[PDB]
Design an enzyme around this catalytic site. Structure first.
Site, short mmCIF file in Angstrom:
data_model
loop_
_atom_site.label_atom_id
_atom_site.label_comp_id
_atom_site.label_asym_id
_atom_site.label_seq_id
_atom_site.Cartn_x
_atom_site.Cartn_y
_atom_site.Cartn_z
N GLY A 13 5.16 -43.29 -1.17
CA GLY A 13 4.65 -42.04 -0.68
C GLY A 13 5.65 -40.93 -0.83
N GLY A 15 5.56 -38.63 1.43
CA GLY A 15 5.12 -38.21 2.75
C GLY A 15 5.29 -36.74 3.04
N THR A 16 4.78 -36.27 4.17
CA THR A 16 4.88 -34.85 4.52
C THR A 16 6.32 -34.32 4.67
OG1 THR A 16 2.74 -34.96 5.66
CG2 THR A 16 4.13 -33.04 6.09
N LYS A 35 11.65 -44.28 5.25
CA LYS A 35 11.39 -42.87 4.98
C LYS A 35 12.70 -42.12 4.99
CE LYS A 35 7.98 -39.60 6.27
NZ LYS A 35 6.92 -39.64 7.32
N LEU A 77 3.23 -52.06 5.83
CA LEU A 77 1.87 -52.45 5.51
C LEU A 77 1.62 -52.21 4.08
CD1 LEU A 77 1.59 -51.43 8.66
CD2 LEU A 77 -0.73 -52.30 8.39
N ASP A 121 -1.93 -34.69 12.38
CA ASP A 121 -2.15 -34.68 10.92
C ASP A 121 -2.76 -36.03 10.49
OD1 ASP A 121 -2.31 -33.51 8.42
OD2 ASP A 121 -0.26 -34.27 7.87
N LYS A 123 -5.19 -38.41 8.51
CA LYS A 123 -5.81 -38.33 7.20
C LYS A 123 -5.83 -39.71 6.62
CE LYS A 123 -1.37 -36.54 5.53
NZ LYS A 123 -0.74 -35.19 5.25
N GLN A 125 -4.60 -40.98 4.01
CA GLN A 125 -3.23 -41.34 3.50
C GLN A 125 -2.25 -41.75 4.57
OE1 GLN A 125 -2.73 -38.03 0.68
NE2 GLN A 125 -2.42 -39.62 -0.88
N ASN A 126 -2.56 -41.54 5.85
CA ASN A 126 -1.57 -42.09 6.86
C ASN A 126 -2.24 -43.07 7.79
OD1 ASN A 126 -2.61 -40.21 8.66
ND2 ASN A 126 -1.02 -38.67 8.33
C1 FB8 Z 1 4.26 -41.29 5.38
C2 FB8 Z 1 4.64 -42.67 5.80
N1 FB8 Z 1 5.61 -42.94 6.66
C3 FB8 Z 1 5.62 -44.30 6.79
C4 FB8 Z 1 4.69 -44.89 5.98
C5 FB8 Z 1 4.44 -46.31 5.82
C6 FB8 Z 1 4.74 -47.18 6.86
C7 FB8 Z 1 4.39 -48.50 6.66
N2 FB8 Z 1 3.94 -48.98 5.50
C8 FB8 Z 1 3.69 -48.07 4.53
N3 FB8 Z 1 3.19 -48.69 3.44
C9 FB8 Z 1 2.41 -48.18 2.39
C10 FB8 Z 1 1.84 -46.90 2.40
C11 FB8 Z 1 1.02 -46.50 1.36
C12 FB8 Z 1 0.78 -47.36 0.32
S1 FB8 Z 1 -0.28 -46.86 -1.00
C13 FB8 Z 1 0.03 -47.96 -2.31
O1 FB8 Z 1 -1.63 -47.18 -0.57
O2 FB8 Z 1 0.09 -45.52 -1.32
C14 FB8 Z 1 1.34 -48.61 0.28
C15 FB8 Z 1 2.10 -49.03 1.35
N4 FB8 Z 1 3.91 -46.74 4.66
N5 FB8 Z 1 4.06 -43.82 5.29
C16 FB8 Z 1 2.94 -43.94 4.40
C17 FB8 Z 1 1.73 -43.23 5.05
C18 FB8 Z 1 3.34 -43.48 3.03
#
Ligand code: FB8
EC number: 2.7.11.22
Length: 284
Positions: A13, A15-16, A35, A77, A121, A123, A125-126
């Site tokens: 990501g 991320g923001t 992050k 995840l 926020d 959405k 994507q989070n």
């Molecule tokens: C902004 C943020 N801060 C912490 C996370 C975060 C926390 C735990 N696990 C993940 N795993 C993950 C996310 C997206 C995708 S995918 C292939 O579907 O793009 C694949 C695995 N991410 N994130 C995410 C929301 C990027």
């Protein structure tokens, strides 16, 4: 220096606030999401989030401040809801799974709202999902660093009209937008500017007035010159969702944030009388 604790497996990501990596703790072999934000108030506040633990919140493991970088280490995840929604696009996410995801997200929100923590926020994507049927709230929010546009599609109208104080109701609105999107397979209000977002809301739900939203016309960005669109029916907005779902969604999309359903009250809605916890089919 800090990164020498961690093998960057891949980038997941932008991320923001910063980039998120899948990473492997070089000593323990724990796999985590890492992050990296580029740069005291924030340190103390973010450190308090280490205590906001719930099965439907992505667990914040550690917060490191080192050399003008803030790192946040999370439980990992494997995918976001956006990817599952895009993959399920030909067929649709089955209603029992939508139901289970909504109910779970509501439980998460009820928890953080009870502790006076807002997301701000939400959405697709989070929202992150696993093979076990769980969904979890990530990326709590209080252009990106890659100049990508932050999406307005799930922004509550009070934010868009300039309200200085957010309430927990902003989250309920976001989640209602996401619920609708799971059901219809298309974003409910895909604005591409602040006024386009507001006017998409207005075109579907009616231009708000003093009757449905007392104080609206006194909002900072309210303009008497807004066009006056009549409301549409929900039967047109989220077909073929059933009456119980429609009723719940309508309550999550009330204009007045004081009338909007709470997470806790939403969990009591008859829509959830037959909720179950299905297993999604995930391709990892
Ligand atoms: C902004 C943020 N801060 C912490 C996370 C975060 C926390 C735990 N696990 C993940 N795993 C993950 C996310 C997206 C995708 S995918 C292939 O579907 O793009 C694949 C695995 N991410 N994130 C995410 C929301 C990027």
């Amino acid at each position: 220096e800090f990164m020498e604790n961690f093998q960057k497996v891949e980038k997941i990501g932008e991320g923001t606030y910063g980039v998120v990596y899948k990473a492997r703790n070089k000593l323990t072999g724990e796999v985590v999401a890492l992050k990296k934000i580029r740069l005291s108030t924030a340190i103390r506040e973010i450190s308090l989030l280490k205590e906001l633990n719930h099965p439907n919140i992505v667990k914040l493991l550690d917060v490191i401040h080192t050399e003008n970088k803030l790192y946040l280490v999370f439980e990992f995840l494997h995918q976001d809801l956006k990817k599952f929604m895009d993959a399920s696009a030909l067929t649709g996410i089955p209603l029992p799974l939508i139901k289970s995801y909504l109910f779970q997200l509501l439980q998460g929100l009820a928890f953080c709202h009870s502790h006076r923590v807002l997301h701000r926020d939400l959405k697709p994507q989070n929202l992150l999902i696993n093979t076990e049927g769980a969904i979890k709230l990530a990326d709590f929010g209080l252009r990106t660093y890659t100049h990508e546009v932050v999406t307005l599609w799930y922004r509550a109208p009070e934010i868009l009209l300039g309200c200085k104080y957010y309430s927990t109701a902003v989250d309920i609105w976001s989640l209602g937008c996401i619920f609708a999107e799971m059901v219809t397979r298309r974003a409910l209000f895909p604005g591409d500017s602040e006024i386009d977002q507001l006017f998409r809301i207005f075109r579907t739900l009616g231009t708000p007035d003093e009757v449905v939203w007392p104080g609206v016309t006194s909002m900072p960005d309210y303009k008497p010159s807004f066009p006056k669109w009549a409301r549409q029916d929900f039967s047109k907005v989220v077909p073929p969702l059933d009456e119980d779902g429609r009723s719940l969604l309508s309550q999550m999309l009330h204009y007045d944030p004081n009338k909007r359903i709470s997470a806790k009250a939403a969990l009591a809605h008859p829509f959830f009388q037959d909720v179950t916890k299905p297993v999604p089919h995930l391709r990892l």
